[PDB]
Design a protein around this ligand. Structure first.
Ligand SMILES: [Zn+2]
Ligand SMILES: [Zn+2]
Length: 77
């Protein structure tokens, strides 16, 4: 584990770790869920990133950050 970083400056959903926190600064800047890529609005963003259930699944995956994946939105083909 690592020391918990600052709150997301875009959706206000507190990130657990640095990977989750950067990913957030990235998808919230485009109002897309960090976890389900729901393509929110700038006022749907805070309410949805606060309530998404895929958030918990991906973030329980970030507790096992030792794995290969970080941001499943950057790998494309
Ligand atoms: Zn955010
Ligand atoms: Zn979501």
């Amino acid at each position: 584990r690592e020391l918990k970083p600052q709150t997301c400056t875009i959706c206000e959903t507190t990130p657990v770790n640095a990977i989750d926190a950067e990913m957030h600064d990235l998808n919230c800047s485009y109002n897309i869920c960090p976890y389900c890529a729901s393509r929110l609005t700038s006022d749907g963003l805070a309410r949805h990133v606060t309530q998404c259930p895929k958030r918990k699944e991906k973030v329980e995956e970030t507790e096992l950050y030792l794995n290969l994946e970080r941001i499943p939105w950057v790998v494309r083909k």
